[PDB]
Amino acid sequence: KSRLMGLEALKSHIMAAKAVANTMRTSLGPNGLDKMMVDKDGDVTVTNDGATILSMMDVDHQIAKLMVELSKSQDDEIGDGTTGVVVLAGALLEEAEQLLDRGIHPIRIADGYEQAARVAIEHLDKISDSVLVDIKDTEPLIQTAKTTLGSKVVNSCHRQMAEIAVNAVLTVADMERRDVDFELIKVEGKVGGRLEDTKLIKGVIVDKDFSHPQMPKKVEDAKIAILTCPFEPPKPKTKHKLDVTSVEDYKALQKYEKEKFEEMIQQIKETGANLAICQWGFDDEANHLLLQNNLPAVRWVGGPEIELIAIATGGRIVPRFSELTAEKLGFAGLVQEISFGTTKDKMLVIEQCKNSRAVTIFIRGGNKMIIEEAKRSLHDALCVIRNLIRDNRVVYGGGAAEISCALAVSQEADKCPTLEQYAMRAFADALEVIPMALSENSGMNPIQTMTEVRARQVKEMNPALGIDCLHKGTNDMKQQHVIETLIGKKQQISLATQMVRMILKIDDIRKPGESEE
Amino acid sequence: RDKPAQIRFSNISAAKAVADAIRTSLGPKGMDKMIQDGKGDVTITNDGATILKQMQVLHPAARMLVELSKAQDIEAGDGTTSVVIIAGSLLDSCTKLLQKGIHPTIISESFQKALEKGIEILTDMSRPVELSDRETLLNSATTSLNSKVVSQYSSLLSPMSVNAVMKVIDPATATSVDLRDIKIVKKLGGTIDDCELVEGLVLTQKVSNSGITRVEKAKIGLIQFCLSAPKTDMDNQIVVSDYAQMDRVLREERAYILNLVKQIKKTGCNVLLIQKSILRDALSDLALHFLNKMKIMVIKDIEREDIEFICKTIGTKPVAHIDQFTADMLGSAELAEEVNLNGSGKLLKITGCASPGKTVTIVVRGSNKLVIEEAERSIHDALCVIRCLVKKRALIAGGGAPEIELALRLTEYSRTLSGMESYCVRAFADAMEVIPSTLAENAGLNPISTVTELRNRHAQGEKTAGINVRKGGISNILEELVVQPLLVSVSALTLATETVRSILKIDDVVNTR
Amino acid sequence: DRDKPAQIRFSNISAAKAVADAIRTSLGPKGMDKMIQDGKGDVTITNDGATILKQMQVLHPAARMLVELSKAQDIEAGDGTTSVVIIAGSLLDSCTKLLQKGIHPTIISESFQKALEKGIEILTDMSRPVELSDRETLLNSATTSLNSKVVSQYSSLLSPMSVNAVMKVIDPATATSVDLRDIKIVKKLGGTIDDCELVEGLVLTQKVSNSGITRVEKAKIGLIQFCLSAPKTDMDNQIVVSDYAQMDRVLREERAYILNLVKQIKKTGCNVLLIQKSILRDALSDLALHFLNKMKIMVIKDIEREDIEFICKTIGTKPVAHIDQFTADMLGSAELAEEVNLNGSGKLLKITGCASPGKTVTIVVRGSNKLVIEEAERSIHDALCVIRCLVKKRALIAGGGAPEIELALRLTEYSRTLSGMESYCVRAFADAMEVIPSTLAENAGLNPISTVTELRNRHAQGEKTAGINVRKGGISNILEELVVQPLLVSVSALTLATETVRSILKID
Amino acid sequence: ADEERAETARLTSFIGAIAIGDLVKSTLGPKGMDKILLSSGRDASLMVTNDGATILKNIGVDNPAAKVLVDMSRVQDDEVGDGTTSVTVLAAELLREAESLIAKKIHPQTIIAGWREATKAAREALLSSAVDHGSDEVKFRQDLMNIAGTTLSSKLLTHHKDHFTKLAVEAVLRLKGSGNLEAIHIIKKLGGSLADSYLDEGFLLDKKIGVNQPKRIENAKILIANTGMDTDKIKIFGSRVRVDSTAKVAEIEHAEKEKMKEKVERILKHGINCFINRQLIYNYPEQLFGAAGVMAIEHADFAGVERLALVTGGEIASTFDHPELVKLGSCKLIEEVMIGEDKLIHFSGVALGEACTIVLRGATQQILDEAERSLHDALCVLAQTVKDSRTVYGGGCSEMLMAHAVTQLANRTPGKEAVAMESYAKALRMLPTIIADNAGYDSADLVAQLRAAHSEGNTTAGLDMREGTIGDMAILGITESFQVKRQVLLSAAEAAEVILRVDNIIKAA
């Protein structure tokens, strides 16, 4: 049995954590550097967004396991700082450690970090503006959704993705609460186009069942028929072969399909669309004979899809042929059949104004990894406004806010004294570590560029201008247009200052001898 | 390459542990050192203020600190550990700042900027107290003497220290009352009770026996002249082979010189400090006792101390052979007094003389030199802390306590500088909290109760005050009667700043062959 | 690095001389046998280049280049398997240093491959033309090589039969390469040497015709790559009887295949039929083949494919794998075709005369027993080979490695004439020729060290006269005891060294 | 999953990817020396390469940063054709720089920074060395003939290039401003000589059903079909494969014949004289097409039936889903004709005028597929050369030009950017070392003189690996098209810059 004492556990918790924290701090900003992922299979992928890459990273060490779990709740509400929490959660870490190695209790300064976290929050909440609106946010969202794409996937602004990312939110932002959730719009990766090729859709879309291209591709009404029941004769993922008692009975079999096509087209016709969304992909030899009866059936698409596209309209799926009902059929403001990619077939585009419980931005890319990180772009540009929806709020800096956030916490240390002065010592500096650690991964001295805004924070307060994430010569967090929700920074603090305290939870570091295996 | 870092780190390493093993300081802490040396020699050492100098350490930065140990002791004479205790307080930040992306140059002026601002704030916590005030002399001596060897004889030494300084005092807040000025002499016999402040110049020489002058009318000593006699400076062709002719040479040699010493007493001399050189034998043992037949106080091989002080005070120069008589370059003397208290000790006391408005000569006595040195180093450091208060008129927190006051407040200037070295300042501005908790270091069990408190004890006391390190109990660090002039602490910071800043420029590997 | 590649190519350079050295003291019959343990762990006694390299061998790229060397000599010639392996390590000494002498290995190669050109230029210049249309001058340098070499006994009998095949198969004056494709090496079991024959049509290994014609005129050469048995499942025929009520019903359609394809043979008409083996073809109905024989077609049932191959291309019996492909036209037309029990014992279908692509002759190796049939092989074949070398490069030359030492002397001075950074290259190149007869003047005994010294000087003096008598192994005449290189036996090994070497020098 | 920080991954990035840039630069130039191909894990059989793409495709590499280059190698090799071994080394050339720069304290951010702008500075200097040749057809003729076979130089088989490039330029000479490589039907087919590699005007099939289908036809209608025959496609003419009763399995064959026979009808009733099937044709419908005057070619080439659909104007049958209904391939000429040793079915009168069949004839397929590997990369450059008719002066000429350009720009820049940008144009100066040292001749002579030559500036004298010495680029044929360079100048610095942002590598392997 292994028995660690105090720092020993901590020191054991220090090893990979800072090393993991080290990989974060060179990822900070465009100054920072992406984290490549080579899988357990050896799959080589450039990635980011710590919880993402920390999910790709295999967490054996304990403290890293929360780094996946902590940063999870970080990415959801915020979208950024997931790579930045482990920075501070690694930065504030050896803050306490050296204090613990200065003889300072975990009983002592650990509260002081949260106690300095609130006041840094309290300080942060002043920095820049807790205020935005559905109009203002757009420009922060522009400089978000330009750079969110313009960091991960490309460095350029792609507008059709940029504001469609924010308007997708803005489309379901006002659907609920004046607050969207992160599922309440969806990002659907498929590549038929380039990156810039995308589909903003107020409902979910799929590639329509095509049992032959030459058969007419049609779309009608506003509405769709979402079908567990037969749209035409259903097929239950099972072959049906040709058995007819006579050579004439085969051609007599031919009518059975087409008549049951239009009959159950007519049975779908009155109810919704003329089109299927059918939980059963039916015989594609027969399906294109119904595509020869036209009114295209969408079939051979997931059983979860009929569920999906139904609920996305707030509707249902018709379970039985006798159960056919317009409400048991899905909806849309417009169902349209639109080409997926430029050259390929026309995917059924279901744009749902009869409800939108997910407004799906559909995205195309030259490649996955770019459309991925364009998706992975959108998600953050989607997440940052998920802060904005709740409080329309932002801030400018990690090298403006924090050095200023620290500046309050700075002398507040000796305003503390006894216990948490060494905390708000070790807190304030740990804040300025991020502009340091970003100036680190910048081409600049992490001390001097931190000294830069240090002098500036000895001058300007609550600065809209702070060090360079965008790696410019001028450092203006407003005009670097590094834009982060003051909710997020606040939540990040709450989340980043969190883990370090949590390793102190109870007095038991006690293991049977296995704390990792 | 790697060569600069390691040894520079080792300069920060080997010297730090030495400087870390330092702080047991201020009184009853730790256990005594009966020291088997690196050579095995066994030696008992206590009160590490002196042990600093006594400590024998090699390695470039480690031996530097013993040479830096006198740095506080050389000019001041109070709180000799103050520079050595902070010799590692800078080495605290050294590692980090080299590792922080901060250049040894940026660390170099960092020591300066921390030194610059440090001694600045210390002036605010320096309470100016009168430079000539008997108390600010007596109590500075007392407080020191309380920490120095004798705490009882302090009441004798402190005014004698005052009276020795107030005689030589050149009242100022600048340099006055030097150590070359006050002449501290030791006499076997008497007592520390009989340790005598003597305004006039008292030469400590080896005087032949007694029946010599304790009395007035003496022309002063410091003579280099030999006595020319047959078989001394004069040619004798009398050949020595047979014992009788070998006998004939000493008798003319011995019979003649007694007239020479009469000529020496004819000069008015009851005292001769004889050159430690020999012109031939210079003054022979024939001549020396003939000098003692004339009641002339005579020391062959006289110390260098009574050679320069007799030049400094009495204004004395050698005089020629007494056949050639003298130029009377011997300074003015009147009372040539050999104190025999139970006959112990040979002490030449010149009461009245030429004097340079200075040089009190204080006779430090006792049953033995050990009893004497109980007073001497005490009265010296009492003179010194008085001299320090004559040097700098003030009394600050004693025993390293104000550095923790300087700690917090230099952390404020860590923000005011807002520079790359402001971080450096910050690292060291928190590295001055180390000493009081660390002074407690070495004694015993269940340790930690001392540590963060002594940190906080000023921190909790805002920028005002904390517990005294040498006294104890929650009070003002500054006003205790553990008090030292501002000089001592601003000295220490100035001293460790440089030698430790040299480490920053210590680089590669270079050794004189 | 080029150096790791060098160290590789040095290892290539090294290992290429390593196992090839077993060939070098093996040069000629005076070159010595090498007992060679094998991957099976078996002693193998071999004096020859083609056998030694290809028998026991290893994984090194040089060993890969070894087997290429005699082989590329073989497809060119089949003559000089050893000598072509002797020229490599020769140049491999000319090669290695120029690297170490500060010359780039492409410059080294573009030297030697060009140094080849200029170098081997004078070989044919040193050489002598001989008549490739005249049977003797063919047979001469054929047998003169065979007089210079081992095979005599049945050669001097079958070396004119070689040329008898060669004279027949030589259309032009340069006699092209006399591709031995125009000749057919065949073996009858019974019979003696003198039974060895040359037939314009093709002799076929065995034959099977049961009720059929043993000798047939103007013979349509049939090819059955189809079956005479209806396709197989559990039987030869299509008959599998599980019921009689069904058997009457099975009776109806199983009557055709045995009739039709059989009759289709004589419906298109056939005087002959080539049929691969009842193992090579699924089933051959004898009950059908008997009637097929009895139709008085000449059936060779179970005939080997590679003769069929030589029948298909050389005498023009075009592929029939199918009824869609079975016509009277894709049949060869045999001016005579005969099953022959004559020429000793055993049956052979002999197409005698045919309409043929190229000039097709079947030279049937024969002898009182099997080895004497095998003695008849190189008896026809070796001459065919030394002929096909003499014809492909028309001129003959005095052999024995004198032209090695002869032109080794010269090209040096002409290399030295080139100057440039490749003069030292081409001279090293030119030198390499000397070592081949050295080993020869070594293996034949006594002093190679002397031999090439005077010779290359004699080659500035008498040249063609003074040379290496393979029997003597010293300064002598390959003219006095006749050693003739039909140029291609020499012309083959010329570039093959430089080529793989150029490659392996260019090889990283 | 193990996090690789800066120098761990980055050295691992250098050691592989620069050496990946090495054995390929060992192949750089025709006198880039032959590399015996020693395969990793399989296929001990050894080719010997003058082109490093082989090694990249042959030999797998464990270095992930090196796993990137082979793809970027294939980016060039597929998309751009030539520039394949070159895109790998110039990155390594820029990586050799970042060897220092990283350990020289320069963050890879900055290392990209200059190379961001520096990439165009060479591009722009190579836009300056970009000058339109081929502005005339005779120019275009020789401008193709310039960079057509120039694509084939380092590529192992530059010899039959004589016949090959003439073929290669003619087909693209026939393109006449409209690049079509599908209108060029690529047939690699054994038989005859390698100089017997051929270009047909028309379409062609290496597939020959035989002579039991009509061989030559004029005004022939070609059915382009996946239509099956024994395969039993739709629209029952008689029982297909099924069991509907006791004897229904027996009603299959004879009525499957009728089904095969009316799958003659449906196919024949197009009025075709040729039925070209990308799928099987049963012998009865086959021969009943042969009896219908229809040439029915079994399992005819996928790309062929596709190009026959493209070049001849044919539609695929939708796999008999157009029994009578599919638009025919129409080629007025059917020729079953022997190129090489094999009768090949030639189709002329095809819809496209640029429609051609280049028949690459192997005397051996090792050179044949090599001819085809040397074929299309030219055609890649050729279609590029078609669209942009122009050159850039290779052999280090524009390299050193760009080198002296970007460096003197790296001399007028020289902020953080030149730290990359001086590192940049040195690669432009370092590749001229590679080919000349491949040529086995001092670069420090030539390069530093080529420097002086391009420090005077030069479009003409450049290092000729043919001569192994500095020599003219007048458009001598060693003057490269602007086509590949811009692509390599784009593609090469990328993988460098790509790894420059990701030094952080998380490895669960």
Contact D381, D171 (CB under 8 A): no
Distances (CA, A) of B22 to B52, B435, B453: 8, 10, 21
Contact B423, B431 (CB under 8 A): no
Q: 3-state class of B408 per DSSP?
A: helix
Closest alpha carbon within chain A to D502: A34
φ/ψ (deg, to 5) at D204: -160, 160
State the SS3 of C135-173. Answer: HHHHHHHHHHHHHHCCCCCCHHHHHHHHHHHHHHHCCCC
Q: For residue A446, which residues of chain D lie inside 8 Å, CB to CB?
A: none
Give the span between the Cα atoms of C139 and C147, in whole angstroms.
11
CB contact under 8 Å between A458 and B415, yes or no, is: yes
Residue A69: burial class (beta carbons within 10 Å; 0-12, 13-18, 19+): middle
CB contact under 8 Å between D212 and C324, yes or no, is: yes
Q: 3-state class of B150 per DSSP?
A: coil
Given the structure tokens 């960079």, which residue do they identify? D147
Q: 3-state class of B333 per DSSP?
A: strand
Give the span between the Cα atoms of C14 and C66, in whole angstroms.
12
Distances (CA, A) of A54 to A49, A64, A372, D64, D190: 8, 8, 17, 20, 55
Q: For residue A407, which residues of chain B lie inside 8 Å, CB to CB?
A: 415
Given the structure tokens 């916590």, which residue do they identify? B125
Q: Which amino acid is at D225?
A: A
Give the span between the Cα atoms of C486 and C497, in whole angstroms.
18
Give the span between the Cα atoms of A349 and A356, in whole angstroms.
14
Contact A112, A427 (CB under 8 A): yes
State the SS3 of C203-240. Answer: EEEECCCCCCCCEEEEEEECEECCCCCCCCCCCCCCCC
Elucidation method: cryo-EM
Per-residue b/e over A359-374, b at no fewer than 16 CB within 10 Å?
bbbbbbbeeeebbbbb
φ/ψ (deg, to 5) at C234: -100, -5
Q: Which amino acid is at A127?
A: I
Is B81 known to sit in a ligand binding site?
A: yes
CB-CB neighbours of B444 under 10 Å: 10
φ/ψ (deg, to 5) at D53: -55, -40
For chains A and B, count residue pairs whose Cβ atoms are closer than 8 Å. Answer: 56
Give the span between the Cα atoms of D241 and C281, in whole angstroms.
29
Q: For residue C2, which residues of chain D lie inside 8 Å, CB to CB?
A: 26, 33
| Distance from the C104 Cα atom to the nearest Cα atom in chain D, whole angstroms | 5
- The pair of three-digit structure tokens given for residue C18, joined into one six-digit string: 């390593």
B213 noted as active-site residue: no
Q: Which amino acid is at C239?
A: I
Interface test with B, best of A22, A95, A109, A414 (most B CBs within 10 A): A414
> Which of C239, C219, C221, C237 lies closest to C229, judged by CA?
C237
CB contact under 8 Å between D508 and A442, yes or no, is: no
Contact C387, C166 (CB under 8 A): yes
Closest alpha carbon within chain A to D241: A242
- Output the CA torsion sign for B404, B406, B412, B413: negative
Q: 3-state class of B42 per DSSP?
A: strand
Residues of chain C that touch chain D, judged by Cβ-Cβ distance less than 8 Å: 1-2, 5, 8, 12, 59, 61, 64, 103-107, 324-325, 503-504, 506-508
Q: Which amino acid is at C457?
A: N
Interface test with D, best of C98, C110, C324 (most D CBs within 10 A): C324
Q: What share of chain D is helix, strand, coil (3-state, %, to 5)?
A: 50, 15, 35
Contact D62, D10 (CB under 8 A): no
Interface test with A, best of D504, D505, D507 (most A CBs within 10 A): D504
Give the span between the Cα atoms of C401 and C393, in whole angstroms.
18
- The pair of three-digit structure tokens given for residue D459, joined into one six-digit string: 């479009």
Q: Which residues pair with residue A278 across a beta bridge?
A: A227
Residue A336: burial class (beta carbons within 10 Å; 0-12, 13-18, 19+): middle
Contact A120, A493 (CB under 8 A): yes
CB contact under 8 Å between A455 and B418, yes or no, is: yes
| Distance from the B339 Cα atom to the nearest Cα atom in chain A, whole angstroms | 60
* One-character DSSP codes across D329-359: EEEEEEEEEEETTEEEEEEES-S-SS-EEEE
Q: What is the resolution of this structure in A?
A: 8.7
CB-CB neighbours of D115 under 10 Å: 27
> Which of D339, D337, D336, D335 lies closest to D363, judged by CA?
D339
Distances (CA, A) of A427 to A21, A95, A113, A118, B430: 16, 7, 6, 11, 15
Extract the runs of DSSP E, i.e. beta strands, from D349-485.
Answer: 356-362, 461-464, 469-472
State the SS3 of C337-398. Answer: EEEECCCCCCCEEEECCCCCCCCCEEEEECCCCHHHHHHHHHHHHHHHHHHHHHHHCCCEEE
Contacts of D260 (CB under 8 A, 6+ apart): D229, D230, D282, D284, D285, D288
| Breaks in chain C after residues (C–N exceeding 2.5 Å) | none
Pairing of the two strands B202-203 and B183-186: unpaired
Contact D248, D224 (CB under 8 A): no
CB contact under 8 Å between A445 and B101, yes or no, is: yes
CB contact under 8 Å between C107 and D440, yes or no, is: yes
**Degrees (nearest 5) of the Cα angle B188, B191, B195?**
85
| Distance from the A390 Cα atom to the nearest Cα atom in chain B, whole angstroms | 37
> Which of D134, D96, D44, D139 lies closest to D431, judged by CA?
D96
Residue C182 is given by DSSP the state: G
> Which of A47, A152, B39 lies closest to D1, judged by CA?
A47
Is D485 known to sit in a ligand binding site?
A: yes
* One-character DSSP codes across C302-345: T--HHHHHHHHHHS-----SSTTT--SSSSEEEEEEEEE--SSS
> Which of A196, A200, A180 lies closest to A188, judged by CA?
A200
- The pair of three-digit structure tokens given for residue B428, joined into one six-digit string: 């060291």
Contact B177, B353 (CB under 8 A): no
Contact B306, B319 (CB under 8 A): no
| Distance from the B129 Cα atom to the nearest Cα atom in chain A, whole angstroms | 30
Contact B160, B390 (CB under 8 A): no
